[PDB]
Amino acid sequence: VPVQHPMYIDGQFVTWRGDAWIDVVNPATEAVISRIPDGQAEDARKAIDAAERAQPEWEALPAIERASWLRKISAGIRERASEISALIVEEGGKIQQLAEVEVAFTADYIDYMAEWARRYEGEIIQSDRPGENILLFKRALGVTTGILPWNFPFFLIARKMAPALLTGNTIVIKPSEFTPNNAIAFAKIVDEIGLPRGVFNLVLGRGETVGQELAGNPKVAMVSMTGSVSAGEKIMATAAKNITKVCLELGGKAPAIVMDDADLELAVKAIVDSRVINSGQVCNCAERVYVQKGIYDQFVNRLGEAMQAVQFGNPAERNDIAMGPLINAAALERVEQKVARAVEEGARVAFGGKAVEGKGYYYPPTLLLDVRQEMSIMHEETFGPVLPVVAFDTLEDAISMANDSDYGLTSSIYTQNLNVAMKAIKGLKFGETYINRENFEAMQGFHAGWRKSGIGGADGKHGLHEYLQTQVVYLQS
Amino acid sequence: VPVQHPMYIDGQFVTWRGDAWIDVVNPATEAVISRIPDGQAEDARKAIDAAERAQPEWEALPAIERASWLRKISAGIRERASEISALIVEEGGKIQQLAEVEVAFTADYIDYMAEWARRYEGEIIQSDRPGENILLFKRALGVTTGILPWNFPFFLIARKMAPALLTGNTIVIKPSEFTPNNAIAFAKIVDEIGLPRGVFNLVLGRGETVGQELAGNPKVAMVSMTGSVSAGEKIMATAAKNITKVCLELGGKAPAIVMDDADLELAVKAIVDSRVINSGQVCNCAERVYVQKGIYDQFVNRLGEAMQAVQFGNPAERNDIAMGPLINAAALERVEQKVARAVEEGARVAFGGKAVEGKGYYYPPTLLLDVRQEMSIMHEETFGPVLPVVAFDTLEDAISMANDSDYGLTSSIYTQNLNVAMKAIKGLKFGETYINRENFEAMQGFHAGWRKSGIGGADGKHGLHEYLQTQVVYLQS
Amino acid sequence: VPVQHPMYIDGQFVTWRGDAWIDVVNPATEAVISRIPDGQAEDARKAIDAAERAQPEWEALPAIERASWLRKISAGIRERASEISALIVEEGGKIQQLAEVEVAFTADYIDYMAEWARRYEGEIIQSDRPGENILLFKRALGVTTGILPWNFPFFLIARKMAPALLTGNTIVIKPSEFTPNNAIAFAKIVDEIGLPRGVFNLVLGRGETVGQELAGNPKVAMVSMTGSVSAGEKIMATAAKNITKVCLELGGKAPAIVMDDADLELAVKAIVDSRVINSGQVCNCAERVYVQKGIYDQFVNRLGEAMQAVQFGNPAERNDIAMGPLINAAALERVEQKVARAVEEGARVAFGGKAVEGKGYYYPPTLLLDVRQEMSIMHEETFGPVLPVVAFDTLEDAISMANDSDYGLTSSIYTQNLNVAMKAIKGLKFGETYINRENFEAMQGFHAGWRKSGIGGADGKHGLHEYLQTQVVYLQS
Amino acid sequence: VPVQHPMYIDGQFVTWRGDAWIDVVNPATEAVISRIPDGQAEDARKAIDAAERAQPEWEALPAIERASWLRKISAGIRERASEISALIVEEGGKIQQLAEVEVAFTADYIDYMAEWARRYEGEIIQSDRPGENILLFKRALGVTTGILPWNFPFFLIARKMAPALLTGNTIVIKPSEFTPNNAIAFAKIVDEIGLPRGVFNLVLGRGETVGQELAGNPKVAMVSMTGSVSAGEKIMATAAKNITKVCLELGGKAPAIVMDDADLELAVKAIVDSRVINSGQVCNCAERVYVQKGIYDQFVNRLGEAMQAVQFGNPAERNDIAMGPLINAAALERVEQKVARAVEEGARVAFGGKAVEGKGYYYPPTLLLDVRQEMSIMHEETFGPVLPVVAFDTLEDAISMANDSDYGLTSSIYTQNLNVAMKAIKGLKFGETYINRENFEAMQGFHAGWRKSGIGGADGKHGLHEYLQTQVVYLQS
Numbered sequence A, B, C, D: 001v002p003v004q005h006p007m008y009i010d011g012q013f014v015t016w017r018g019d020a021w022i023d024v025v026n027p028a029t030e031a032v033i034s035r036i037p038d039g040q041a042e043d044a045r046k047a048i049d050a051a052e053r054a055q056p057e058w059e060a061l062p063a064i065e066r067a068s069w070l071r072k073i074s075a076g077i078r079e080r081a082s083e084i085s086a087l088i089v090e091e092g093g094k095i096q097q098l099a100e101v102e103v104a105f106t107a108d109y110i111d112y113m114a115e116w117a118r119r120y121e122g123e124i125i126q127s128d129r130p131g132e133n134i135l136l137f138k139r140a141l142g143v144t145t146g147i148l149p150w151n152f153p154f155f156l157i158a159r160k161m162a163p164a165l166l167t168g169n170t171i172v173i174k175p176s177e178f179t180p181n182n183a184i185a186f187a188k189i190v191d192e193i194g195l196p197r198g199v200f201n202l203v204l205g206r207g208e209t210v211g212q213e214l215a216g217n218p219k220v221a222m223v224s225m226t227g228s229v230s231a232g233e234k235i236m237a238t239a240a241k242n243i244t245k246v247c248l249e250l251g252g253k254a255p256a257i258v259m260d261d262a263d264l265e266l267a268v269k270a271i272v273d274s275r276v277i278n279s280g281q282v283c284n285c286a287e288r289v290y291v292q293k294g295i296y297d298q299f300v301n302r303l304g305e306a307m308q309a310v311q312f313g314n315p316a317e318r319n320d321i322a323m324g325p326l327i328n329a330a331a332l333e334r335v336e337q338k339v340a341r342a343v344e345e346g347a348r349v350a351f352g353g354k355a356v357e358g359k360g361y362y363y364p365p366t367l368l369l370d371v372r373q374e375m376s377i378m379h380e381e382t383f384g385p386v387l388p389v390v391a392f393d394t395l396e397d398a399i400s401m402a403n404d405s406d407y408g409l410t411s412s413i414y415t416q417n418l419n420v421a422m423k424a425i426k427g428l429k430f431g432e433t434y435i436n437r438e439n440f441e442a443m444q445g446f447h448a449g450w451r452k453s454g455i456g457g458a459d460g461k462h463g464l465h466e467y468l469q470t471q472v473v474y475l476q477s
């Protein structure tokens, strides 16, 4: 338009009266597709205060009724699927096929979470005291907040708000300043179906301003955020002031282990069909590939051939490409610098390794060989489509190198030996380990990272429980 | 002696080579009973590095074997019970009877926790994918740290190390600089029974130095601490730098609600026999008493009479007193100032209200009437034996005032009406609610505070789980 | 028609070739509404063999896919709701309003059960052996059977088949010979949506013949049945021959306790609005009323007035009545005999007590006073609308008399005292206890009777688990 | 002596006044070692009535106090370990080493079970009704009974009474008429430590008499039994009369699968060191050995050599033998007949195959080759040390043949391929599957058989739950 978006506070869209706006750009063409308010703490406070006023009534509603509200939202999403998918493609730069999957998955995820209504249980504990009953109830936290990243922006809205609402909490969400459009569409659905005012709020702005208020406001019981480790650190430090609970997912460096006795065809496909599910921008797919000698040569060749076939370009104009552009300028620059450094350190460029120059932010699928566990490229989130390869002799070497990281969210291994599999599972220090398949968490699993990958977690029963707290009642006589 | 204590690092006692020492004083006589090293970050690092080296081997041990080690420690504690009780009395200032209970309870707690060995379960989750198994294993965090307060110093050692060790973690503990003696005795038992080196480490020093290193060191998977909200804030802020998990218990202002239809005798006894279980220094017993009109006069009189009978003095020389001295000078001063402020604001002194002057730090049982929810005494941890009383008309008023606090750890109510009880339980926003009995958490319950009272929790199954993290394995075909 | 119904075996309706048929009559008019085959063991065997052939493929399907099939069935039911409700009214004799509720509830129940797909969990247990993993998987039983009663005939189909199918089992169902029509309609929906052949089978006939084969066939992993204790005994005895698992619900004599401090209005309404939800033919609503002296007179009068307003008649022609006819002739006769015996024993008829003579099987709402715990009417399922009332002095007397029964499925009490409630809960020996409300189990609860009321149970997580068995895997190294 | 044993009823030993006695013989020498009363139903009734009188008070005791009682019993057992081991050796015919293990294991098992005291949980379920709480409590069944077999006679006492007592139930136990001595010693310990009268009762006699009364008495909430499928059938049929819950373990035909890629050394040792842990009389060790072609010849030879080294004889006079005598004459006879039949059918005797003639009941380790899945020896519990071997080509053949049995308690497989292991686990229809190790259930697992192997189960959390039933409370407002 470029359309100027309003925030969603206390059951209604509120037109921004400030003079400062933030431009939302299309990563493929660099053109301005929309504008959002340069929100400030006060805007966050209004949303938080509204969420607080609505929380008692919301938690008082039988759980099945909150589930009913969630189902109305998912149904609204499916009705506007193509519209929302296009928004994601346009601002996030991901290929049409993946955007479509994200939208459909988000709706299914919400429905799945709504099913917890009559299932989350409190407990009755035996007491040492005659005639006493120890009742442990599961209560809502109260007001919660969600801070979202640019990757899987739409899904992450649901990943936080669905469990939050189901358990009786209210929420205030802030999407990334780079991908707010899909979030506005989510708010419109919430508004259209009539969700009780204050239960779901959407605030817009930067991390340093709005994000910080969502983390530091004393009325917030828990702050949930997904994205960079740097932002997570600032969020937690701020939450500390009020002893506010934090729920963080800060990505990492997913390592992949390919053994000699591994199904070469399966391994290569799993690694490329994972590093491709979002222009090589996801936090679950192998960013560190370890291949042992015995099969090294064969593996590197097939993998090299697979990456050559990977075409990049504008997602909106090409439905036959496997990769879109990077989110923004800084992202592209950091990729270049890291690849260059790697090369200077001794890394062998088997493919790509040269940034494209022109409209949008494109970087060619890059394959690096003769890489050393020591090199900085093995200890720095490379955003773009860069695959560093490291050879090894024994399982212990591979497991040891994979564990050698400040991140511990996702891992994977390919082999056919029972002992090797059980050994890798026991030795790998990660929240997730994929065996002979591609990386992608199920809604009923538990996406939780070790070390700097995060705190708490998301999805399944355990993800739902992050939004609940206990009240232990000692009923005497 | 005054004996000069060494630290316990990597399976052996290490003599302090520094020139700076911290004097440990007897709160009843102000005499120096011992001295501990003015530990520094480097000392904490040595302990942490030792804990890291021992962790893999320790976690590799079958759980029942770790339990066996824990049982040896509890047995060592019971053998030295009277010796340890005296240490607690001497440095903590608590009465002989309570010290004895703390020691016996600590041993039982350790045994109870050891019983979790073959019981904590991982899970097997149904997958949407044909032939796939989703295995969710429960793994240890790795290296953990514990920072302890002066109240219930001995028990708190076990409250953190027992669950930690059982689940395969190693630990580094720092007792409060005011009550380290009981902790040294704990370390001697660990050393005598031969616990594998590095699994249990004891470092000595101040919070700003040693404590901060236990919270900020990158090798620490989780930092556990009990004490003041101010220290908890600094601990969490520091942990944020490395996205380190935190487990905090920061006390509060336990409110008590006395209804008209309440067993007057029971209520009064429960409130005084709780505010007395540690010279009125515990974080679970009523520090805010709400009494409704109908029974106000009767209740205040019986309560006043009960408090007059409360004798204070040196725990070591008197086994017939209900109260000992406050932990230190600053503690005593803060109590005076808060009582004085309360009075100036309109508070009516029905008993006590005047600090004692002489050796040690004694403050008389104080009863304040005509107090207003507004007054600062209702929003500030009063350490000493001060009981503020506030009258009310309806249950809703009492519940509303009790919830009006930045703390939400413990609560209580006295009544005989089914509807009133269920209403109080549903309305009270606390981690714990005691009905018609005194405040004291069971080892099988879950001591976890709401709002600023903390993060995570302790005791029972949920306390044990704080020391475990998940590893989700997607086994395809 | 009277239409002649076929059975549903191995994915298709099979026309009966036998010469013997069973007439299905309308309890209100005694007219023949339909006819079903006088099935024999061989027919059951064909269904069981078909279920066996389909089970491996069915269990092999991801759980969410089985859930998808279940959702198609519930959706089919809602589409034909009015049609099915009429069938129930016509053959079961229940009032239009209750039939409608049963149908809608059945559909919601199926959807609720389908939600367990990704939720039922296996477990990972710590081993005493180094390097060993103990994996406990939840597997299907295989082929299961369901034998249904005439009360809530439609719902009971789902209560057994929904959990059975969800967990990977196949099933063969036999409805009561008195109420098979609603079951045929259920089979048509299964056939129309295309459920894989053999997964759901419907056989028709008597208990002694078809029912016995469903209990005694060696290929059946578990036999599930709801109805009379006499039939349950024969079913279990037969299952014993092959050590076949049994799941039984055999009704009982639900006792109700009315205290002096009880909300008289609430109590009376709860007792009449429960004894009315199916012409006084349900197995959950008070069939034994205990009222204490203090409020006796008041209670008996209000209750007497409430029962006078209860009109009986043909459900199909009257949508303003609270009661329909009894299921059959024998049922009516047994009611008469029991009321008469009661009277001869000293029972005081305060209302009704005289069977109606003419078309259909009607019995007037009957109120009996001055009844003694001793009388046989207190130890015999009275089918019809008969309410025996017994006075008592203390809570202990009431609890003791309520427990004095071979049945222990459902119970209830009305009071406002916290102590009384907790005392009743602790003292009452029943699978269910309702406090200050009417009797009706939630889908997320657990309907399981004590003593002769049954074995195993239905509904919620525990009901779902009845259809699962464990496979413990000891994976060494 | 031969000593004449009294029963243990209502807290005291009761001298038998009947004229009929049953001789207890030493299976190695056929000499009379003791005599027990030929108990009758009335004796069982006295015990059951006593158990009923004590149950309310026992369940009323806090769970930890019941655990304390259990710990006193285990401690009493360890004090008399050698004495009890000798009793088992003498009457059961098992080798000294295994008897010692059984006694020590029994004591550890009791302690393990006592640890459930503060751990078994009830649940709090979300309701669809505003202001309603659904409380699911775990209650005791009441009076339970245990009927024991001759194998692992001592352990089985604890396997039933430990979980029973811990959860608040009382119990009446009847040991096998062939091995009652160890049970009398158990009763003496119970009497000496002072367990409340009626909680633990011991009755003596035959199955047809005393056993039947323990299964058919209306006051019994659940009957638990381990032994032959024939007796289990009679027990369940009788329990049916009162809809009495049953808990059965009826042995079976444990199959073992040896793949070509299997650790030959490990497999052979696991099979012989399992079939030897009780003179080849256990219900968990391979009684059906399936070996594939590729490794057949090698495996059969090593296995043949291992069995030759197996020496048999009097356990009391030889502490260097791997096998004792069979329990009784009928047992020996049935083994002969089955081996002979097998031979006539085409079975090739590679070793043994000829019954010993003289004092006691000895049968030589027998190895049968060229056996066919069809042969009756593959479908009949062979008691003695007979190992039938069957060759196969593919995994599917082995899995299919193993599943081809009316029993489904225990199974095992030896291989090194990840896919093979996961395939065997998924394909094998048994309550237990051992991979690359010998057969022996852990106390924290769940010993539960599929098909005719039983109903319900024992050990771990699930075994404990068999002794608990639910009480669902719907607390409105």
Ligand SMILES: NC(=O)C1=CN([C@@H]2O[C@H](COP(=O)(O)OP(=O)(O)OC[C@H]3O[C@@H](n4cnc5c(N)ncnc54)[C@H](O)[C@@H]3O)[C@@H](O)[C@H]2O)C=CC1
Pocket (backbone or CB within 6 Å): A147, A148, A149, A150, A151, A174, A175, A176, A177, A205, A206, A207, A208, A210, A211, A212, A215, A225, A226, A227, A228, A229, A230, A231, A232, A234, A235, A328, A330, A331
């Ligand atoms: N926001 C900006 O002005 C600029 C961002 N970038 C790049 O954008 C990328 C976005 O990465 P993501 O994976 O989304 O992770 P991220 O952590 O940078 O952002 C995720 C979410 O956290 C918020 N956030 C950032 N800092 C925060 C703070 N201090 N307190 C509270 N919230 C905060 C963001 O606004 C967003 O909603 C980064 O790699 C960064 O280098 C580059 C130039 C400028």
Ligand SMILES: NC(=O)C1=CN([C@@H]2O[C@H](COP(=O)(O)OP(=O)(O)OC[C@H]3O[C@@H](n4cnc5c(N)ncnc54)[C@H](O)[C@@H]3O)[C@@H](O)[C@H]2O)C=CC1
Pocket (backbone or CB within 6 Å): C147, C148, C149, C150, C151, C174, C175, C176, C177, C205, C206, C207, C208, C210, C211, C212, C215, C225, C226, C227, C228, C229, C230, C231, C232, C234, C235, C328, C330, C331
């Ligand atoms: N079936 C008949 O020929 C007659 C039945 N009745 C009455 O019908 C009533 C029906 O009561 P419900 O609450 O439905 O309980 P119920 O136990 O009599 O019937 C419930 C279900 O169990 C089956 N069943 C009955 N006996 C069986 C057996 N021995 N083995 C296997 N299955 C068996 C039935 O066919 C039905 O599907 C009884 O009160 C009875 O007196 C009266 C006269 C005849």
Ligand SMILES: NC(=O)C1=CN([C@@H]2O[C@H](COP(=O)(O)OP(=O)(O)OC[C@H]3O[C@@H](n4cnc5c(N)ncnc54)[C@H](O)[C@@H]3O)[C@@H](O)[C@H]2O)C=CC1
Pocket (backbone or CB within 6 Å): D147, D148, D149, D150, D151, D174, D175, D176, D177, D205, D206, D207, D208, D210, D211, D212, D215, D225, D226, D227, D228, D229, D230, D231, D232, D234, D235, D328, D330, D331
């Ligand atoms: N009891 C006897 O008079 C004789 C027994 N035997 C042999 O003794 C063996 C013992 O085998 P186990 O593995 O112990 O299994 P089992 O089932 O024969 O005995 C286990 C337990 O069940 C009891 N029992 C047996 N029949 C029962 C019934 N109908 N009702 C209630 N309880 C009953 C027994 O008394 C014992 O306590 C059998 O193989 C049998 O052939 C041989 C000749 C006589």
